[PDB]
Design a protein around this nucleic acid. Structure first.
Lengths: 72, 204, 62, 190, 259, 108, 174, 137
RNA sequence: AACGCGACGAUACUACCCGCACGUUGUAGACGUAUAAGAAUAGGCUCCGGCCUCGUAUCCUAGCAGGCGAUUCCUCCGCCGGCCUCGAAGUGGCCGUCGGUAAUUCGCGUAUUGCAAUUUAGACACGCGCGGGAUCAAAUCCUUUGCAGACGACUUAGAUGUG
């Protein structure tokens, strides 16, 4: 493409007031449509493996589980 | 520091085009006369074809009814590429903006009054201090030659002659610095020691 | 067809200029300069060999 | 990720003198002189041992560290051409029209020129001017062979590629018309 | 019509300018590059053609030729030019003594009542010290100028015109060092230059003049129909045109009496 | 002879009025003082007398040279520009004209 | 999020007749001030338990200053952040001097690489790595190299911004 | 094999390298934080050259040619002070051209109006004999 | 380019030029309006010793708004000549004469502007003055031409001539 030698007409990034007002409107009823459908209706990944102290954190989990079992 | 001079002559080599234009436009409106030399050696950041694409987009904008009147006059010279940037940073349609533009003179190369004057530099627009070491840059002289500037070879021959004369001037300058250091050494043995001990205690 | 500004058309013309039309024009210019040569041939400051001065918008008014 | 340090090494043979300015690299040896400018890459040249050139960058990225690999090979290529040189051997083939190849040396401009005649019967002569520093000779060893030799791999390989691109058939069938000049062997003179 | 000749206005001057001399190289011999003449008219010739490949090869062709009357131009001046970032600048013009009254008529709009004092003090600097002002101005051309031109004028008395005012034109010298062409220009002062020496037979030359004027016409004849691009009425003719590749079929002497 | 100078003032430039985007207030002028770059340097010049010296066309009391008096009020911004109030607001054609900033009244 | 400080916030549900001497929970919160630290406490306790500001009271808020704010440490931050897709896990390392400085370095880092906000970042663990082998990321690994020393190429000098015009061109070497 | 390279010669940040800050004081690098921060300490007995131990950005620091030879990494203020006095960093700083030019600025800033007058006239007496020597040369 | 520029010819008046004499003469704004290497920025400069973040540097900087004499000197500045140099919008160097000159030192003046009021001071341009040099011109109208033409405008010719 010879766009360097012969550029085309530019796509203006200046925003018209007419289009700015509609986009705020269309963003509004999208949020209403999303809320209406959610109203209509019909997880922890864990400690990372690269964490250097997952082993001493797991034994804290087992030790507190023993104390909870002993208390109960 | 901050000084008011009669005329500040700026060497345009090594300067970014827009960063130099905003500094110059502020001094012109503040009441400072500015001469810029070597506008074929200014830099515009980015790759060369981006500066060429911007100028080819500028060349598109031409009026339809009569190009001789009112149309955007596309100036190809490197001095006038710089002058276009400065004129867009000045209210040139008022009397104050017109007065600020008359305090500016823009030249290609170094004209023979200004090759014996000292050329200032602006650290706030210098390419080596501002740009990242890996980025690409273009020269205004290269962009001008590809859009119709006819006097790249003429300015290059005159600059070669100007630097041939300046090499002669530096050779006389080195001799003066050699002779000044020899004269100071001899005068240190004939000066009264109370004069030199007082000057050393005062930092001079 | 090929344009008048085609690259291969220009290269063919450059081969014509150097090899055929070149020495023809150089020969005719030697004769014409010879006839022009026939017609034309047919202190320091006091002699003017040193060049001095005869008989302002670049500098701001100082 | 901004690696703090990265370095590579170029060994230097005993018969060579490598001189490096700001980023201008000059290699001298038996066969001649080679210079090339490297101001487009940020690099710190240094001397590590008696015959080792050290090239380093500091606080570069993965892109800047990888640009050290291209300069190590580029300087090492200048070492080889100055010591051993480069040789490209090219063969020209034909079916019916014999290709006449003529090599002359221009006294002015100091460069060889190769004239190709009678390429599939065409009456146009094809003149290729070589790079300064590459010599072309007709092989009196095998049939239809040229030798492009020199010190710069850039000059030898580009001049060899110019000959291939100037003898290329047009508007024909590639599967049937096999005429052309092709690079057969690449290597060193020594 | 063509948009290349778009400002369809009357030509600014009657004579019309060259606007481009040939590109100069110092290895060539010293030669002038242009001349002047007066249009006489046209005639009919028969040429024995030698055009291999033509249907009229080795046959007789009848062609129309144009006759331009060329009295010998008289060289009166020398103008030096320097290279500039702004373009090309004239630095020094050196005239000669004994300027004719014909070219002196050119610097006057009313010659019949003037005192004819043009170049009277310039005739005195050739004998003021020894000619120091003249030699200084030529040395300024030799050491500073990049190309030099020659001022030559035609004579109207040799031509059958009621005009008496000569036509003065600058002609560029090509092919040599600036020192060599200056010594041509000073030696060529006060001397008639014939068209035998400037041009030669069998040579394409470039012809520059102002066309025939037709005054105010409409779009029927100005454009050739059934903003700038819209066909509008106005002036047709008296435009400056540069024509290209016209062959010199003959150069008559005028003395020969069998032209 | 002497071959010295007689300057007992600090040079200044009249930049603009007090303004925002579009509304300008001529009662306060903005002055750039030679060699000031922080508010700390501008604090020395507070209260110092400012003179704007210009030229007229008619002699009035033995002079053709007229003066408008003022004093420095407060620092402006972070760059050492200062605000100055005069007995009459300065002319709008003097944007970029020089002023004389004098060391009286002196607290040193 | 500013000059953060670590806070020890201890709060409890309001004492009632059914349950006197209540549970007394404790958290460590990085907050700009006292008032924010209480708010983050009740926000985090509301997600975990059914204790809010209306039925709860703050027992103590104390600032946990660093033991050694003059010793260089390698820190490990385990965090969750919320994006358009959902909740993700990261573990990032920071070579700093204080535990608060590692948290400030983390907030600027997550805002830079991933455009994460303060409202979306959950800091789970800030651990000082006692031993050198515990450092896992290569950008900290090159900092803990033996005999670490490097130059500083292309150093732009600190020229005052009011010095518009300079007489000689600057140098980027020292 | 001849290699002739003249590329650069930088000072390196390292443990034991003495820095100069914008305040005019001296610090010595103890441990390196990152590529633009270091931990330093100036234990000098001169109040003009003393710096508290802490984090210093390298953008606010200047690298002096003085390196304490075998300073341990992570050394506390007691060990740095012993190596500071043993190497004589204050004496080596005084001989540096950076401290000589700084002392020149301190003396020139401290001139009174009377001292400027005596500076100017004593320069004229010194300039006179420089001018006679230059005319002889 | 009808508000871009260069070279050259003749320039009557007026005053074209030189010297010095002053302006109720006009300014987008004088007050030390002082300062030439080139080039690189992952390198440079150098007297070849060494030096480089840094123009917070260098020069100049004292005397009724700034004398006359002395000693001491060829220190600094300026005007005119000769030799040369300087064309990108054109200048500086050397030599010489003359004048001024705290580099060291000295004798006699300043008051009253009354406790501050721009320190009327620079530059270019524009005028008026003398007393001296120099110069003795063109264009338009009118008549004519038709290479031109709606009118203007354009190519021409009108002073003794190849009219």
């Amino acid at each position: 493409a010879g766009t360097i030698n012969k550029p085309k007409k530019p796509t203006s990034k200046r925003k018209t007031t007419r289009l700015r007002a509609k986009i705020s409107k269309r963003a509004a009823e999208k949020k209403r449509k999303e809320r209406k459908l959610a109203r209509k209706n019909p997880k922890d990944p864990g400690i990372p493996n690269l964490f250097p102290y997952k082993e001493r954190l797991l034994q804290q989990r087992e030790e507190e589980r023993i104390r909870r079992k002993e208390e109960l | 520091m901050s000084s008011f001079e009669s005329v500040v002559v700026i060497d345009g080599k090594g300067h970014l085009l827009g960063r130099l234009a905003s500094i110059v436009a502020k001094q012109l409106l503040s009441g400072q006369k500015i001469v810029v030399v070597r506008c074929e050696a200014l830099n515009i950041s980015g790759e060369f074809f981006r500066a060429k694409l911007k100028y080819h987009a500028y060349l598109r904008k031409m009026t339809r009814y009569n190009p001789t009147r009112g149309g955007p006059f596309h100036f190809r010279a490197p001095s006038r590429i710089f002058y276009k940037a400065v004129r867009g940073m000045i209210p040139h349609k008022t009397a104050r903006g017109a007065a600020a533009l008359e305090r500016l003179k823009v030249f290609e190369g170094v004209p023979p009054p200004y090759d014996k004057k000292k050329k200032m530099v602006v650290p706030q627009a210098l390419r080596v201090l501002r740009l990242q070491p890996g980025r690409k840059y273009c020269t205004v002289g290269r962009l001008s030659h590809e859009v119709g500037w006819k006097y790249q070879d003429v300015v290059a021959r005159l600059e070669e002659r100007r630097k041939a004369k300046g090499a002669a001037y530096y050779e006389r300058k080195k001799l003066a610095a050699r002779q000044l250091s020899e004269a100071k050494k001899a005068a240190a043995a004939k000066v009264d020691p109370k004069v030199s001990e007082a000057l050393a205690a005062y930092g001079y | 067809a090929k344009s008048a500004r085609a690259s291969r058309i220009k290269e063919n013309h450059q081969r014509f200029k150097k090899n055929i039309a070149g020495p023809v024009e150089a020969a005719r210019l030697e004769r014409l300069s010879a006839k022009l040569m026939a017609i034309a041939q047919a202190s320091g400051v006091k002699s003017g060999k040193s060049i001095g001065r005869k008989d302002s918008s670049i500098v701001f008014p100082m | 990720m901004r690696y703090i340090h990265s370095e590579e090494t170029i060994p230097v043979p005993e018969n060579l003198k490598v001189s490096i300015k700001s980023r201008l690299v000059t290699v001298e040896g038996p066969r001649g002189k080679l210079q090339k400018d490297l101001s487009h890459i940020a690099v710190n040249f240094s001397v590590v041992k008696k015959g080792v050139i050290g090239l380093e960058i500091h606080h570069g990225s993965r892109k800047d560290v990888a640009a050290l690999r291209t300069v190590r090979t580029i300087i090492n290529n200048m070492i080889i051409g100055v010591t051993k040189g480069f040789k490209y051997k090219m063969r020209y083939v034909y079916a019916h029209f014999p290709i006449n190849v003529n090599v002359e040396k221009n006294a002015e401009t100091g460069c060889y020129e190769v004239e190709i005649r009678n390429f599939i019967g065409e009456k146009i002569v094809r003149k290729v001017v070589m790079a300064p520093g590459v010599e072309v000779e007709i092989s009196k060893a095998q049939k239809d062979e040229l030798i492009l030799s020199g010190n710069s791999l850039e000059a030898v390989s580009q001049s060899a590629a110019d000959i291939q691109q100037i003898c290329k058939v047009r508007n024909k069938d590639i599967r049937k018309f096999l005429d052309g000049i092709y690079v057969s062997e690449k290597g060193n003179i020594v | 019509g063509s948009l290349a000749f778009l400002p369809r206005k009357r030509a600014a001057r009657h004579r019309g300018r060259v606007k481009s001399f040939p590109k100069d190289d110092p290895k060539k011999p010293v030669h002038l590059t242009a001349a002047m003449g007066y249009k006489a008219g046209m005639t009919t010739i028969v040429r024995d053609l030698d055009r291999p490949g033509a249907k009229a090869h080795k046959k007789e062709v009848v062609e129309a030729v144009t006759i331009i009357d060329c009295p010998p131009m008289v060289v009166v001046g020398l103008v030096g030019y320097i290279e500039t970032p702004r373009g090309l600048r004239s630095l020094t013009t050196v005239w000669a003594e004994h300027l004719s009254d014909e070219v002196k008529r050119r610097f006057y709009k009313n010659w019949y009542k003037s005192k004819k004092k043009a170049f009277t003090k310039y005739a005195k600097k050739y004998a003021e010290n020894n000619g120091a002002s003249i030699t200084r101005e030529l040395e300024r051309i030799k050491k500073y100028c990049t190309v030099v031109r020659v001022l030559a004028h035609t004579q109207i008395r040799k031509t059958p015109l009621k005009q008496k005012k000569a036509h003065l034109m600058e002609i560029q010298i090509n092919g040599g060092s600036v020192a060599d062409k200056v010594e041509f220009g000073r030696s060529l002062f006060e001397k008639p230059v014939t068209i035998d020496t400037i041009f030669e037979k069998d040579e394409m030359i470039d012809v520059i003049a102002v066309t025939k004027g037709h005054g105010f016409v409409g779009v029927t004849a100005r454009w050739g129909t059934k903003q700038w691009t819209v066909a509008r009425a106005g002036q047709m003719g008296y435009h400056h045109r540069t024509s290209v590749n016209h062959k010199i079929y003959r150069i008559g002497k005028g003395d020969d009496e069998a032209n | 002879p002497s071959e010295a100078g007689h300057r007992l003032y600090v040079k200044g430039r009249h930049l603009s009025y007090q303004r925002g985007r579009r509304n300008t207030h001529p009662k306060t002028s903005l002055i750039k003082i030679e060699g000031v770059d922080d508010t700390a340097a501008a604090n020395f010049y507070l209260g110092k007398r400012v003179a704007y010296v210009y030229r007229a066309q008619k002699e009035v009391r033995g002079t053709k040279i007229r003066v408008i008096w003022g004093k420095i009020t407060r620092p402006h911004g972070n760059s050492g520009v200062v605000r100055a109030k005069f007995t009459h607001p300065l002319p709008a054609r003097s944007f970029g004209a020089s002023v004389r900033i004098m060391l009286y009244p002196s607290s040193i | 999020m500013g000059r953060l400080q670590e806070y020890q916030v201890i709060g409890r549900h309001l004492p009632t007749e059914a349950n006197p001497n209540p549970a007394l929970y404790r958290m460590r919160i990085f907050a700009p001030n006292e008032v924010v630290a209480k708010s983050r406490f009740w926000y985090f306790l509301r997600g975990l338990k059914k204790v809010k500001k209306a039925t709860g009271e703050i027992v103590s808020v104390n600032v946990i200053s660093e033991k050694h704010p003059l010793k260089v440490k390698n820190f490990g931050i385990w965090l969750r952040y919320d994006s358009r897709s959902g909740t993700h896990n990261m573990y990032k390392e920071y070579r700093e001097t204080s535990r608060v400085a590692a948290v400030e370095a983390m907030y600027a880092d997550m805002a830079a690489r991933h455009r994460a906000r303060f409202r979306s970042i959950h800091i789970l663990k800030v651990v000082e790595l006692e031993k050198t082998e515990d450092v896992k990321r290569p950008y900290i690994k090159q900092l803990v190299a033996k005999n670490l020393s490097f130059p500083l190429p292309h150093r732009v000098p600190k020229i005052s911004t009011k010095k518009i015009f300079s007489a000689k061109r600057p140098s980027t070497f020292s | 094999a001849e290699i002739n390279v003249e590329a650069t010669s930088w000072r390196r940040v390292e443990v034991g390298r003495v820095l100069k800050l914008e305040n005019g004081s001296l610090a010595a690098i103890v441990e390196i934080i990152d590529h633009k921060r270091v931990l330093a300490d100036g234990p000098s007995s001169d109040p003009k050259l003393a710096t508290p131990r802490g984090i210093v950005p390298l953008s606010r620091a200047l690298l002096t040619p003085i390196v304490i030879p075998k300073l341990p990494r992570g050394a506390r203020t007691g060990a740095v002070k012993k190596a500071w006095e043993a190497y004589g960093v204050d004496a080596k700083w005084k001989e540096t051209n950076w401290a000589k030019k700084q002392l020149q600025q301190e003396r020139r800033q401290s001139l009174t109006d009377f001292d400027r007058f005596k500076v100017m006239r004593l320069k004229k007496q010194r300039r006179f004999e420089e001018r006679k020597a230059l005319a002889k040369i």
